[PDB]
Design an enzyme around this catalytic site. Sequence first.
Site, short mmCIF file in Angstrom:
data_model
loop_
_atom_site.label_atom_id
_atom_site.label_comp_id
_atom_site.label_asym_id
_atom_site.label_seq_id
_atom_site.Cartn_x
_atom_site.Cartn_y
_atom_site.Cartn_z
N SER A 176 0.79 -1.23 0.00
CA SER A 176 0.00 0.00 0.00
C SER A 176 0.83 1.28 0.00
O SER A 176 0.24 2.36 -0.10
CB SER A 176 -0.94 0.02 1.21
OG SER A 176 -2.02 -0.87 1.00
N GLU A 212 -4.58 -7.19 -5.68
CA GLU A 212 -3.66 -8.15 -6.30
C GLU A 212 -2.22 -7.70 -6.21
O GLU A 212 -1.30 -8.53 -6.18
CB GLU A 212 -4.04 -8.37 -7.77
CG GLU A 212 -5.30 -9.15 -7.98
CD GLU A 212 -6.55 -8.33 -7.70
OE1 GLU A 212 -6.51 -7.09 -7.89
OE2 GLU A 212 -7.57 -8.93 -7.29
N1 LIG Z 1 -1.36 -10.43 0.49
C1 LIG Z 1 -2.70 -9.87 0.48
C2 LIG Z 1 -3.57 -9.86 -0.60
C3 LIG Z 1 -3.34 -10.37 -1.87
N2 LIG Z 1 -4.28 -10.58 -2.77
N3 LIG Z 1 -3.69 -11.08 -3.90
N4 LIG Z 1 -2.36 -11.15 -3.64
N5 LIG Z 1 -2.16 -10.71 -2.36
C4 LIG Z 1 -4.73 -9.24 -0.17
N6 LIG Z 1 -4.56 -8.89 1.09
N7 LIG Z 1 -3.32 -9.28 1.49
C5 LIG Z 1 -2.84 -9.08 2.71
C6 LIG Z 1 -2.59 -10.14 3.56
C7 LIG Z 1 -2.11 -9.90 4.84
C8 LIG Z 1 -1.89 -8.60 5.27
CL1 LIG Z 1 -1.27 -8.31 6.92
C9 LIG Z 1 -2.15 -7.53 4.42
C10 LIG Z 1 -2.63 -7.77 3.13
CL2 LIG Z 1 -2.97 -6.42 2.01
N1 LIG Z 2 -3.19 -4.30 5.93
C1 LIG Z 2 -3.75 -3.42 4.91
C2 LIG Z 2 -3.22 -2.21 4.47
C3 LIG Z 2 -2.09 -1.53 4.91
N2 LIG Z 2 -1.70 -0.34 4.47
N3 LIG Z 2 -0.57 0.04 5.14
N4 LIG Z 2 -0.30 -0.98 5.99
N5 LIG Z 2 -1.26 -1.93 5.83
C4 LIG Z 2 -4.09 -1.72 3.51
N6 LIG Z 2 -5.07 -2.59 3.37
N7 LIG Z 2 -4.86 -3.63 4.23
C5 LIG Z 2 -5.70 -4.66 4.30
C6 LIG Z 2 -5.95 -5.38 3.14
C7 LIG Z 2 -6.83 -6.44 3.14
C8 LIG Z 2 -7.49 -6.79 4.30
CL1 LIG Z 2 -8.64 -8.16 4.32
C9 LIG Z 2 -7.26 -6.07 5.46
C10 LIG Z 2 -6.38 -5.01 5.47
CL2 LIG Z 2 -6.16 -4.14 7.02
#
Ligand SMILES: Nc1c(-c2nnn[nH]2)cnn1-c1ccc(Cl)cc1Cl
Ligand SMILES: Nc1c(-c2nnn[nH]2)cnn1-c1ccc(Cl)cc1Cl
Length: 267
Positions: A46, A144
């Site tokens: 992000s 993704e």
């Molecule tokens: N790794 C991914 C994906 C993702 N989708 N397709 N490939 N990766 C979507 N959510 N996350 C995710 C998992 C754990 C944490 Cl702590 C933060 C995130 Cl954003």
């Molecule tokens: N973990 C993060 C971040 C994030 N930005 N900066 N650090 N982390 C942004 N989106 N997500 C996220 C993605 C998927 C799901 Cl299911 C839950 C979460 Cl919270």
Amino acid sequence: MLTNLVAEPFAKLEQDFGGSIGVYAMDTGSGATVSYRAEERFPLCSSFKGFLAAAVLARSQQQAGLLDTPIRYGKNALVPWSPISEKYLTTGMTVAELSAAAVQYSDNAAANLLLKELGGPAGLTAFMRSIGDTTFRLDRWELELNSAIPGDARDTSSPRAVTESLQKLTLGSALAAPQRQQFVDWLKGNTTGNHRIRAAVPADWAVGDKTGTCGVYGTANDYAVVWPTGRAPIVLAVYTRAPNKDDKHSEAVIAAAARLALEGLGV
Ligand SMILES: Nc1c(-c2nnn[nH]2)cnn1-c1ccc(Cl)cc1Cl
Ligand SMILES: Nc1c(-c2nnn[nH]2)cnn1-c1ccc(Cl)cc1Cl
Ligand SMILES: Nc1c(-c2nnn[nH]2)cnn1-c1ccc(Cl)cc1Cl
Ligand SMILES: Nc1c(-c2nnn[nH]2)cnn1-c1ccc(Cl)cc1Cl
């Protein structure tokens, strides 16, 4: 070299973490820099959202009225973790509000909506090329882009390029004066980074930062511009990864790397 002073503690830190830590930090007063794996690619996660907001601000310099434009979106725009845009589904939000939500809460729906208006990942990549960043590449959308696959160059940059581009956008000439201060103000208002670079600096320093957390492959990061009281600012970037998909990221490791970087610069 200042890099030499901290090479051994960085190596110890990443061995304890069980992965790779990349750091670049620059003192804009002296010109001193600290490097550790600073030219290696790491997943943006992000953290691309900060540069996304800067690209929107750049566009507002040519398109008068862009920031106040109302943007309505359907429920199919709501991506997991859209905590701000969720609350305005029935009303809509302005471009500036979407930008602030992307930066300060890492709102995923907001980021995708702005990315669309910028021409997608290639459009953001093009903006970064236009300020002299040849390393940054965005390829995919939320969510993704968080796959953080070992060896995959998609949706990556380097700590050095992140720091150089952040410096240009917050302190240099890449944005006009009003837009530059708006970018800084959004970064200062970030809510997601209290345990990362912000945890490494004294309580009286001002900080603007943006985090990223892919989660998988122990991959997480933070970049920041920090202002010591009455002194010229520091710009720095801390990125991590790890070899196994189930490896856990660590906010304390990021904070500890930021501390080492600051110690290496002499602060
Ligand atoms: N790794 C991914 C994906 C993702 N989708 N397709 N490939 N990766 C979507 N959510 N996350 C995710 C998992 C754990 C944490 Cl702590 C933060 C995130 Cl954003
Ligand atoms: N973990 C993060 C971040 C994030 N930005 N900066 N650090 N982390 C942004 N989106 N997500 C996220 C993605 C998927 C799901 Cl299911 C839950 C979460 Cl919270
Ligand atoms: N969801 C809520 C409420 C709320 N009050 N009553 N029901 N919900 C208040 N604050 N938040 C909130 C929490 C986290 C994030 Cl990131 C964004 C928001 Cl807006
Ligand atoms: N330290 C700060 C701030 C600041 N605002 N909020 N917290 N700090 C604003 N300007 N400066 C500054 C001071 C001295 C030099 Cl030489 C260069 C700079 Cl940019």
